[PDB]
Amino acid sequence: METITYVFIFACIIALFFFAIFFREPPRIT
Amino acid sequence: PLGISGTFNFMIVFQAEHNILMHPFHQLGVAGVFGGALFCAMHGSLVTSSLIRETTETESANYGYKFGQEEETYNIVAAHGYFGRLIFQYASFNNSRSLHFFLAAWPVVGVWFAALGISTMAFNLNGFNFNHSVIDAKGNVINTWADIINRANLGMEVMHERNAHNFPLDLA
Amino acid sequence: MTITPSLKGFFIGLLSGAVVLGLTFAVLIAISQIDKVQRS
Amino acid sequence: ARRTWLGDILRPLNSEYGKVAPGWGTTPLMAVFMGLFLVFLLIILEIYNSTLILDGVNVSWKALG
Amino acid sequence: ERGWFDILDDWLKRDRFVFVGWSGILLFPCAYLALGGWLTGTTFVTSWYTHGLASSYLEGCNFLTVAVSTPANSMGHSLLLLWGPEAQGDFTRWCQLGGLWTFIALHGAFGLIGFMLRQFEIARLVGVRPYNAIAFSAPIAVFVSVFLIYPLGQSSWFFAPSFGVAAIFRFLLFFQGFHNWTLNPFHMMGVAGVLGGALLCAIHGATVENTLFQDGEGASTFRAFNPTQAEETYSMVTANRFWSQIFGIAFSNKRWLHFFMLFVPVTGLWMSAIGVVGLALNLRSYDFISQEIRAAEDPEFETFYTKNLLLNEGIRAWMAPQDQPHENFVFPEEVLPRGNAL
Amino acid sequence: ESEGGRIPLWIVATVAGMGVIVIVGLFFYGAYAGLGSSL
Amino acid sequence: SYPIFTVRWVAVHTLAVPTIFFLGAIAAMQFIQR
Amino acid sequence: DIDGIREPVSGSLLYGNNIITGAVVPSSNAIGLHFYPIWEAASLDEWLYNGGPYQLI
Amino acid sequence: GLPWYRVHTVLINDPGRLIAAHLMHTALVAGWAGSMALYELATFDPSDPVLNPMWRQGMFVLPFMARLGVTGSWSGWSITGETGIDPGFWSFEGVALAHIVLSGLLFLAACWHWVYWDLELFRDPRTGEPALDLPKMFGIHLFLAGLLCFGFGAFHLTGLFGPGMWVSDPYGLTGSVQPVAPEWGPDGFNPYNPGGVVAHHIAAGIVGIIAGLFHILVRPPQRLYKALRMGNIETVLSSSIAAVFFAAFVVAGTMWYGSATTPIELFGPTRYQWDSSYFQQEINRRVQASLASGATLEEAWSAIPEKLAFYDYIGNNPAKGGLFRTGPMNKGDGIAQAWKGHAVFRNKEGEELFVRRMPAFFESFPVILTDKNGVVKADIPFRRAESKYSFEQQGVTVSFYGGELNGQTFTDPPTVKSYARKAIFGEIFEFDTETLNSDGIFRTSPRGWFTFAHAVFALLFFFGHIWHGARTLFRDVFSGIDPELSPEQVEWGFYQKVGDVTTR
Amino acid sequence: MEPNPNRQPVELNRTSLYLGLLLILVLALLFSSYFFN
Amino acid sequence: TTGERPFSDIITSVRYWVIHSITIPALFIAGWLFVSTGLAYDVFGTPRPDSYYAQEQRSIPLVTDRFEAKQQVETFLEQLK
Ligand code: CLA
Ligand code: CLA
Ligand code: CLA
Ligand code: CLA
Ligand SMILES: CCCCCCCCCCCCCCCC(=O)OC[C@H](COP(=O)(O)OC[C@@H](O)CO)OC(=O)CCCCCCCCCCCCCCC
Ligand SMILES: CC1=C(/C=C/C(C)=C/C=C/C(C)=C/C=C/C=C(C)/C=C/C=C(C)/C=C/C2=C(C)CCCC2(C)C)C(C)(C)CCC1
Ligand SMILES: CC1=C(/C=C/C(C)=C/C=C/C(C)=C/C=C/C=C(C)/C=C/C=C(C)/C=C/C2=C(C)CCCC2(C)C)C(C)(C)CCC1
Ligand SMILES: CC1=C(/C=C/C(C)=C/C=C/C(C)=C/C=C/C=C(C)/C=C/C=C(C)/C=C/C2=C(C)CCCC2(C)C)C(C)(C)CCC1
Ligand SMILES: CCCCCCCS[C@@H]1O[C@H](CO)[C@@H](O)[C@H](O)[C@H]1O
Ligand code: OEX
Ligand SMILES: [Ca+2]
Ligand SMILES: [Cl-]
Ligand SMILES: [Cl-]
Ligand SMILES: [Fe+2]
Ligand SMILES: [Mg+2]
Ligand SMILES: [Mg+2]
């Protein structure tokens, strides 16, 4: 259970990186 | 080691073996990161202090800046007016370029000395050794805080890798 | 009265602090009054 | 806004918003109380710290006992 | 209306080389005495009677080894006032008992309050927001936690940090060996805020300097800035593209960026302070119970965590007799923990 | 008499700087001799 | 044209006067032998 | 076996570590500065005992 | 819209909803206290106040109930170990039920104050704008606080109309709830004198009534009203948070050092009692009085109360815990069952030897035995090859006086060493480690946990004070600085007085 | 009742979601070892 | 500009150096003699090299009584001679 929990959190962080990069709010100039 | 506790092990053994705390390059490194943190907070606080009113109380001040706007978003004259009075005038930067260069240089140079500390203790030029440097009129050793450090270091030295040494000196 | 040596010390500390602060304020007030800001 | 029986009774207690006495008013009297309070705190602090030691005042579990 | 208070207020707030203010009345004496006490002690004053140590230039120490050392453990948490029951007005005895330590710690504490009041007072006068004062709450929380709260939870001021370069190093190593402080997640958050802050300092300074607009003909580019100019001196749009492409994300909002630069190191310091408050009570992150259960039962089970505790046990046994002289420890050679040969 | 500029600033800097080097040097000398020398 | 005794003057000398006295003291210390 | 004394140190989560104790453990003192790619080991089991992942990483 | 960290700002100009939110916080807190008390009652074992008191069991609210006179359960037991006691309604259970009912009533009042927010009472009669007259509110509330404080002191603590408060002897052996008379002399400021807690409440209460009346009847000076922004409710938040961090540091300190309001029977002993061998010295005193009166050594040691011996054990020192070592002290060393008796070590020459005790700093400590003069006579060696003080070499034996092992002597080295290892912790106890699957690792008491939480929250509230104080005094620039800020206001020398345009 | 004029909409932008999720996930990664002990 | 004379004017003036060519060496010499005369040891209670231990003693004179600490230090000092 411990190992699963660590790996799960890490894998969520990795997914977050993906969304934060590729599915960011695009920066728009005025 | 590639790990959190492993990192601490490396640090404690390095201290035992090189007295890194007493090495001026690690000291420069500390000045580099404590100072980088200080100046980071200082820069952040001073620019944040001086943001120009562009928003109301029920919105984030962040909406007062638009990506790519031409006009600066804080008043550097006000920030300098502040900081120059906090200390005295000529201790504060009124040139943004000079400020931002200092912000780069301080941590970078300090961390280069940190790196060079490790890279030169790699060839066992170690921290300052003032073990028994203070002696009384008879020749009794009068400890200083260096000697207390030394006792801690000895603890680390004698316990580390407890089954690996067969001979009296740890030469590498 | 039962004034122990440490109560006497306490009074000495209190008096000393009051003198330091008293003199500090006396001097600052005096200077402020001598050297006034020019106004509208 | 809604009137109620109790709100009517209490009305005067929330009717002087902004009301002030002129200039410095009682500020000097306040300052005297604040100084006396600073000294009170210092006394109790120094008693607890054993910097001020008074007859009949044993700062220990063996106080009473 | 035009009274002495207002006249004094005028004088205190004149625009002069060194601003004074109302805050100055607290800040200047306290800062001067803390600094002066440190210089006085490191230059002339021993730690023989409190620690069994030489600690001054006078006795032969150098800049790295001098210190104003804490009072003896037997003083407990005495304020150690010059006119107090220990020194009884005798300046020499006061120095020998460690009175300069509480002198420096307490004038230093009030001095810091004065400095933060100054930050507020000046901000108010110039008409800026008081975020610099807000940020300085971190140094205050560190000073108060380490120099006051920590020893107050312990037996005495003896165990606070002594004011000295080597003395502070000893304090770090004490915390490793006795508290396993590296293991503490509050210290780890500290580390991340300090190193993160240093990172942000470096990277923001370098980014601005490398996205500058050409605003002059000079190859040395500092003169091409005017404090009063309206326009940004560097390109946020180019900076943003660069980092988006190198690292994947980038700042797009300058107000956010500079707020984050406050938040990171300030939050880190505040976390480290919380940990030290726990260490005041020996409430450590010393152990992982699961690790210890396994290792006790299985003599083949070894991690870097177990290795570090062996180091800690060495530190404690080898340093305690000289570092804690009031305990009169005598540890026979035969009890000292040692590995093979060394 | 007290006219600013009579002693050039580059000379003041050089002499002051040399003074700093001398006193700091004395301090390093002292690390090897007398108290604190280990001898 | 300029005053001599200012807050700045006081601040400078509160540091500078002791600093030179101290540097003289520490200089002398370099000649102390056990 | 970080120290080359046949005293293996556990670094991985599945072998009893948490995030704080875990590590990829340095290659063996027996190896020293020798280059220890996968293909210098007789097997992955040996490669693993001797701390081959460290060098690769 | 509003950022997440500002959502509650909607209440700043809405007194009715502010009252509602305050009511809901108060409901939550009182619900907590009721729930906490219920959980404690469902886990607390009242069967052994001597070796299994509340502070060994992770009890946090139980001791607060007991400090003020709640000592009995409806089930018939009392925390002093009495049976067949009738506590009336105000048992631990009745207090818990009262808190839960209170919670409910407060929740309902919140609902009403939320719905019916727009009351005329909350409007300034001159402007029609929402307004609170905070200076007069302060007077009203201070007067109330004073009445209550006075009443608590004069009726509850004295026993004149109420139960009194927990008091004990200097060694925490005979504690009970008693009426306490005020101490009006200087010893009233001794933190360890209960009579001063009474005199405090009586006197501060009277001061609060008087100052309350003042604050109701006399308006603030204009100069103070403007300086402290007394029209802005956030100034009250700033100063209130300051008062609260002060109070929180004070209760952390008095919990850590001990006082008449942090008694050791409720919270556990202090670290300082171990440091100074407070209990050991008294035990030794008692034994020596017994020997002088003509008792045998067995008799003398047998006369020591188990409860006294148990305080002279480092497992009860609150500075021996860990931040993530969770739960009751019993989860570590186990549930204490019995004193083994006093261990006397002797070498083959028959000299008494003394085990060096573990200081609280140390997670582990060597085993070293000295004669009465501090000379080393025996140890457990680490390296054996040059050992000269081993128990085998020195023929170290251990004999027990008092407790379960009274009259017994052990000579086999493994057993004598085992007892020496335990003697570093002070007096030796038999523990039940099975019932809770105890892991053998020390945990702190409620004295420790309370001190930690309060010191931490105190320090965090300092940031709260700074922050809300800043927001108050800088309200005008909190969306940013003057877009029209003249360079002259920040240019050196343009104004004689910084920021004063009348001084060009 | 007549509506309350003190109501304000609340916002959390995407970047703030991501920052917040990172904070929470990394805090959990850090504190989880201690919670398991 | 805040009203005071520029430092660079001051330290390049002859009158500054007439004054400070006296006061600076005077202070430095006074500090020197504070040590060389032994006065520093007496003011601050710092042991001279011959005053850490009595001739045959190898025990640190540690203060162990808070309220008698002054007298303990005094007794330690008596033990030297
Ligand atoms: C803002 C300036 C300032 C502040 C905040 C402090 C603060 C402090 N100093 Mg420092 N100090 C200062 C300036 C300051 N100092 C200056 C300028 C000097 C050089 C003279 C010193 C020299 C000095 C020494 C030598 C020592 C201290 C010490 C102290 C501490 C204890 C002070 C105390 O108990 O006072 C108590 C007094 C007051 C708080 C004043 C209260 C005044 C009230 C409000 C008025 C009532 C007075 C009353 C009428 C008197 C009648 C008594 C009568 C019945 C006999 C405290 C940290 C001690 C220390 O650090 O020990 C470790 C110590 O030994 N200080
Ligand atoms: C002042 C608050 C306080 C204190 C001092 C105590 C004290 C105690 N409680 Mg109680 N309790 C409390 C509040 C408190 N409680 C509350 C609010 C609840 C409801 C949740 C409980 C419910 C409760 C239960 C169910 C039990 C206890 C028990 C206990 C005992 C064991 C405590 C323990 O193991 O802590 C362990 C403490 C920690 C591990 C420290 C946690 C530190 C956190 C995780 C830090 C968070 C960091 C943060 C995320 C970082 C932000 C960073 C960001 C800003 C950048 C002890 C007497 C136990 C007992 O023995 O009962 C008989 C027990 O079973 N209590
Ligand atoms: C009586 C105490 C108290 C009160 C009534 C308030 C009230 C307020 N504060 Mg302040 N503040 C306090 C103490 C207090 N503060 C303390 C101690 C600190 C330091 C930690 C702060 C630091 C602080 C900052 C930095 C900010 C505020 C802001 C605010 C305002 C908006 C709050 C909001 O919408 O949060 C909404 C909060 C959430 C939606 C979730 C918060 C979750 C927390 C972080 C974790 C869980 C908390 C847990 C449930 C609480 C347990 C209780 C605890 C005591 C143990 C509001 C007027 C804001 C402001 O000024 O707006 C203009 C603002 O930016 N406060
Ligand atoms: C770093 C510390 C610090 C800082 C920068 C501030 C800053 C502020 N406070 Mg806070 N405050 C503090 C600590 C601090 N506070 C402490 C420790 C308390 C006691 C609980 C308070 C209680 C407090 C209240 C009740 C109020 C403020 C207010 C304010 C604001 C206006 C300025 C003011 O009133 O200063 C106050 C002055 C000081 C902090 C300096 C005091 C110096 C003392 C008197 C020296 C004492 C020397 C001592 C006697 C020596 C003996 C020591 C002993 C150990 C021997 C500003 C945001 C006001 C506000 O928010 O307005 C909107 C407000 O109403 N503060
Ligand atoms: C031994 C120490 C060696 C370090 C030397 C290098 C220092 C500066 C480099 C930091 C880089 C940060 C990241 C890029 C940041 C960046 O982009 O900077 C850019 C910045 C300005 O760019 P410019 O184009 O205007 O000027 C550089 C050239 O184009 C020439 O005009 O560069 C400088 O200002 C250079 C200053 C050189 C002055 C000579 C070296 C001075 C030594 C300072 C250190 C003293 C050491 C004390 C140790 C105790
Ligand atoms: C404590 C006390 C007090 C006070 C005191 C004081 C206030 C003092 C001061 C003092 C001082 C004020 C001192 C000073 C000193 C100084 C010094 C000693 C310095 C040194 C320096 C150096 C050494 C430098 C070096 C350098 C340079 C120059 C540059 C760069 C490089 C270097 C860093 C190398 C009183 C009486 C109240 C009371 C009682 C106690
Ligand atoms: C200004 C300045 C400063 C200072 C500086 C200094 C202090 C400098 C010094 C300088 C110097 C002081 C220099 C010198 C030089 C010299 C030389 C360069 C020489 C040469 C010589 C030779 C080459 C010789 C040879 C010989 C031989 C080989 C043999 C025999 C003969 C003879 C001896 C001739 C400062 C940083 C503060 C600030 C900024 C500016
Ligand atoms: C409605 C009503 C009722 C009922 C009511 C009830 C049944 C209530 C309950 C209530 C309750 C049952 C409440 C509770 C509460 C609780 C709370 C409020 C808690 C909190 C918690 C917290 C806040 C935590 C925190 C933390 C954690 C989690 C971990 C560690 C750290 C800390 C401590 C921070 C009746 C029938 C009377 C009728 C009338 C009406
Ligand atoms: C004659 C018996 C030899 C063994 C001596 C046992 C030391 S005392 C022993 O200590 C344990 C903790 O380690 C407790 O859990 C247990 O209750 C207790 O009997
Ligand atoms: O391995 Mn890792 O640490 Ca470098 O020193 Mn030799 O070797 Mn081992 O001992 Mn010490
Ligand atoms: Ca078990
Ligand atoms: Cl190791
Ligand atoms: Cl070897
Ligand atoms: Fe910037
Ligand atoms: Mg020398
Ligand atoms: Mg000689």
Side-chain angles (χ1 to χ4, degrees), chain B residues 47-126:
Chain B
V47 169
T48 303
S49 75
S50 60
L51 294 186
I52 293 151
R53 182 178 313 122
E54 302 289 345
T55 50
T56 61
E57 61 136 35
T58 64
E59 79 200 319
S60 175
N62 294 345
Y63 290 114
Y65 177 80
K66 268 60 180 132
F67 180 59
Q69 68 180 55
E70 295 180 349
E71 297 238 323
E72 200 35 274
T73 200
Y74 72 108
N75 179 344
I76 192 176
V77 169
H80 176 59
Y82 168 84
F83 188 52
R85 290 178 177 84
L86 183 60
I87 308 306
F88 52 83
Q89 178 175 186
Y90 309 97
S92 175
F93 288 95
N94 69 356
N95 184 324
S96 183
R97 298 189 168 198
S98 167
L99 173 62
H100 286 87
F101 170 68
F102 182 76
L103 295 181
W106 186 277
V108 168
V109 175
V111 172
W112 279 335
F113 285 107
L116 293 173
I118 299 301
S119 304
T120 58
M121 283 176 275
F123 311 102
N124 315 317
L125 184 68
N126 293 333

Side-chain angles (χ1 to χ4, degrees), chain H residues 2-56:
Chain H
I2 182 175
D3 292 327
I5 53 160
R6 316 300 175 76
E7 187 197 297
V9 175
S10 178
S12 74
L13 296 181
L14 286 169
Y15 285 77
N17 284 277
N18 61 31
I19 289 286
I20 309 294
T21 71
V24 181
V25 180
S27 54
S28 174
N29 196 44
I31 289 165
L33 292 177
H34 286 237
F35 187 61
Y36 192 65
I38 289 181
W39 61 80
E40 284 293 310
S43 65
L44 288 172
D45 289 334
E46 173 203 305
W47 186 66
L48 297 165
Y49 183 95
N50 287 274
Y54 186 80
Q55 281 200 19
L56 190 158

Side-chain angles (χ1 to χ4, degrees), chain D residues 22-41:
Chain D
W24 286 104
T26 51
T27 301
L29 183 62
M30 189 191 69
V32 171
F33 285 105
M34 296 179 57
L36 283 166
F37 190 53
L38 184 159
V39 175
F40 174 68
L41 295 178

Side-chain angles (χ1 to χ4, degrees), chain I residues 228-246:
Chain I
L228 295 181
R229 312 294 197 270
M230 296 190 189
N232 184 351
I233 190 170
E234 200 161 6
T235 199
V236 181
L237 185 56
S238 179
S239 43
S240 292
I241 287 172
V244 166
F245 84 67
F246 171 36

